[PDB]
Design a binder for this molecule. Structure first.
Ligand code: XN0
Lengths: 131, 130
């Protein structure tokens, strides 16, 4: 259970690492809720839009799982992303610069192994400072 | 034990919530390593200094553990801190206003239950968005 959930998370990371958003979404429950930094739900449509925009802005991105821990129906991962800023991002046009940020991803899974709730914490400071 | 490690983490949160940094530091191993935002070690003395400054700058701070997971020798917690910004913090002058941020704390424990490695992930944008 915990083991399976963790492996599911690593498959999502592998999908991001081949720049395939659809492979991440494939693990979502039909009723999945994603919470933003203010704990407000973000619609699936908008979450996917943001994910697609990130791959567009950072098309060479690589995610390094620094740590992963699972207990019960939850998994948390500390991840470092490295990329080059080749596309417009959150309004900031390209720089070509090498960037790097760290973040937490937290997922809660249903008994059938699908993601039902999803949170994160992003430290975009290094990225803003750089850009 | 992970159960035990998790309680220790809750003890650290309770110490923060009574604004007692020393009760946090008590859990550290003598040879603890803390990593800054770029993965470089930060001295235990400098961590203490930053923690002390937060208690002074956010003196009504309250931490609510949103989730906690333990496995093996590690614990991760997602925590939300709510406070009023009353003092200078990292060069940022008080606004007097309510502030709130959510973060990760990851702790690695020795077999005897002392913290040997420590990482954080913060979204401090509420403190400087404007
Ligand atoms: C309420 O304080 C905070 O929100 C921050 C914070 C919080 C914690 C800990 C913190 O050091 C900090 C503090 O983080 C340090 O100082 C920040 C300026 C710096 O960006 C930092 C996050 O890298 C960290 O510096 C080591 C800041 C703050 C506002 O007090 C902490 O060390 C800790 C721990 O060692 C064991 C368990 C829990 C904590 C913890 O919650």
């Amino acid at each position: 259970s915990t083991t399976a959930n963790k492996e599911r998370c690593l498959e999502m990371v592998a999908a991001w690492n081949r720049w395939d958003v659809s492979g991440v979404v494939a693990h979502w429950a039909p009723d999945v809720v994603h919470y933003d930094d203010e704990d407000k739900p973000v619609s699936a449509e908008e979450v996917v839009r943001r994910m697609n925009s990130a791959v567009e802005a950072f098309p060479d991105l690589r995610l390094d799982v620094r740590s992963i821990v699972g207990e019960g129906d939850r998994v948390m991962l500390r991840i470092t992303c490295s990329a080059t800023h080749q596309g417009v991002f959150m309004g900031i046009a390209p720089t070509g610069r090498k960037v790097r940020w760290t973040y937490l991803e937290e997922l809660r899974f249903s008994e059938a192994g699908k993601v039902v709730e999803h949170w994160d914490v992003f430290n975009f400071s290094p990225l803003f400072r750089d850009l």
